[PDB]
Design a protein around this ligand. Sequence first.
Ligand SMILES: OC[C@H]1O[C@@H]2O[C@H]3[C@H](O)[C@@H](O)[C@@H](O[C@H]4[C@H](O)[C@@H](O)[C@@H](O[C@H]5[C@H](O)[C@@H](O)[C@@H](O[C@H]6[C@H](O)[C@@H](O)[C@@H](O[C@H]7[C@H](O)[C@@H](O)[C@@H](O[C@H]8[C@H](O)[C@@H](O)[C@@H](O[C@H]1[C@H](O)[C@H]2O)O[C@@H]8CO)O[C@@H]7CO)O[C@@H]6CO)O[C@@H]5CO)O[C@@H]4CO)O[C@@H]3CO
Ligand SMILES: [Ca+2]
Length: 585
Amino acid sequence: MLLEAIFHEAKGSYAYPISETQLRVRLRAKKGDVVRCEVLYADRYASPEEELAHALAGKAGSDERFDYFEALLECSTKRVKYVFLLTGPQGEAVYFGETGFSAERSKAGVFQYAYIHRSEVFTTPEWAKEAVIYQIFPERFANGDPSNDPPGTEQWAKDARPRHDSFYGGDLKGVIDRLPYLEELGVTALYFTPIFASPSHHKYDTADYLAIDPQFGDLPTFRRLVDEAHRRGIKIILDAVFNHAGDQFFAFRDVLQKGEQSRYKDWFFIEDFPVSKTSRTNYETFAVQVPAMPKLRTENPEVKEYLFDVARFWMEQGIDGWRLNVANEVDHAFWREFRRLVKSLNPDALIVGEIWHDASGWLMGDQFDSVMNYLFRESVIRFFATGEIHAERFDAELTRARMLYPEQAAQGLWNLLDSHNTERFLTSCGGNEAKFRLAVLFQMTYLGTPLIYYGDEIGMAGATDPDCRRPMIWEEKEQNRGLFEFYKELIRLRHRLASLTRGNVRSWHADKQANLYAFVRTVQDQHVGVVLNNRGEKQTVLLQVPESGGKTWLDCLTGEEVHGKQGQLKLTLRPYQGMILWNGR
Ligand SMILES: OC[C@H]1O[C@@H]2O[C@H]3[C@H](O)[C@@H](O)[C@@H](O[C@H]4[C@H](O)[C@@H](O)[C@@H](O[C@H]5[C@H](O)[C@@H](O)[C@@H](O[C@H]6[C@H](O)[C@@H](O)[C@@H](O[C@H]7[C@H](O)[C@@H](O)[C@@H](O[C@H]8[C@H](O)[C@@H](O)[C@@H](O[C@H]1[C@H](O)[C@H]2O)O[C@@H]8CO)O[C@@H]7CO)O[C@@H]6CO)O[C@@H]5CO)O[C@@H]4CO)O[C@@H]3CO
Ligand SMILES: [Ca+2]
């Protein structure tokens, strides 16, 4: 077996505890190269003459090129030394340890996890483990208060087509009025984009981190929404824009005024004075040359404590969490501390990060709890919407992302389809509703936290920013209530099947020819199998289903009963159909 392709490290996403006494270990190797993987272990100070405990590493999944093996280690001592025993497709065995590969357990060495401190067990909020979040872009959801509209507000019609500077009147009062709709739908949390004082319609260019923007309301109205939402089982997550401030932020303006006499010049990255008010900025900003968004020096204690107080104040209004905008561009020390402050102020406040590349650095358990799953979106787009990838590539991409981080994080990844930064999924699907629904059926049953973008639930469409930010369709006859009900039902299933919210994932079938993909979620003795006929034609499959995990399943969407004959289940699905099979346990 190609030894150069065998990986593992006693830390990170390959070694970590899931309790003060249990260590999870994962190992990867070239696909099909290793057939069996066992973990021989013991206490670090245990005598050489003592008996080595065993542990069988299960084949947790396999992507395009790798096989992932996973096993659990019981460590009452909270200290452990372990070595792997890999067997090839032809009896060939070999030990794998910190020293290297040897046919003699001794010469291979033995990996070590020095100690499992209880304060380092990756822990995330319990409510966020089984949530369905709804993303609200305030300016475009509901105008409940006509009196606070910006000047030049355009019509709130379905044929409306926003500009980079348009305003429609969306406010917090509108949200509050819509809580019945949100509750009917079944969402358990609402993610808001920035809602703090700022001149734009997106408000990511913060003018005052301590005041709800005037066109959105006031502290009372906000407090009111938080309460009205809570009594309906709906939590509130706000968008923290800590990487940069808007050029209206008091501190920036003071610099713009007093130049390098400013008590706040080191709160930013100023290269020379005076500070530019042109198209050529002489201060660091978000992205490239974006005058309105100067970068905050979060490394500066002065700036850190301020932003931290901004956190305290909103946390004092009762919000349940944060989504950290452009988080990968602010220092780790800030986030570790931000975590200690947040989590001490409220143990159940969820911290979600927005990173557009491997986020394993912020997902060890001492910073964020999860992040936006842009990976889930790229896989879903290319599989369901554009048809650029088949069931087997889909399976792979899905699995590679699964192994990226520790389970605590993976379990809570915000699985989105689109955002206020992309074309609307239904549009990615070229208006094809059939394909659209299958993606939702998948999103609502897959591993992670499903995130619904306002309007998708009733059929809205649109190109990227700003056409994806159209005013919400509220007139019932202009809404696809058929879809609404579809969402509602799936949302009820997810809440009802513990498997769907707390189980693990395992591929079940993937025919690249038929383009049929299926997986199975499992928690304790419950099993739920999702079959997806992602093709425009009627098709028939035979899925391998040993009767140890049940010989009978029930299609949760239709109520049809299916049975296994000699360990094989034969299904027939209509074009673009998907069945959600519960094993009754
Ligand atoms: O004024 C700027 C901008 O501010 C706000 O944007 C915030 C946004 O809403 C938050 O979500 C977050 O953004 C993060 C984003 O969500 C992540 O996906 C990621 O972004 C990456 C992109 O995904 C990736 O595509 C790539 O981006 C490249 C583009 O693909 C490429 O086309 C090009 O983009 C240019 C645009 O085409 C062009 O229109 C122009 O952009 C203007 C916007 O059109 C306009 O709406 C506005 O945008 C606001 C926005 O509305 C606010 O919500 O002004 C823009 C110019 O000022 O110019 C673009 C390039 O100059 O090039 C990009 C660059 O590669 O990479 C990115 C980054 O990896 O990360 C984002 C940051 O975390 O935060 C922002 C800011 O707070
Ligand atoms: Ca308004």
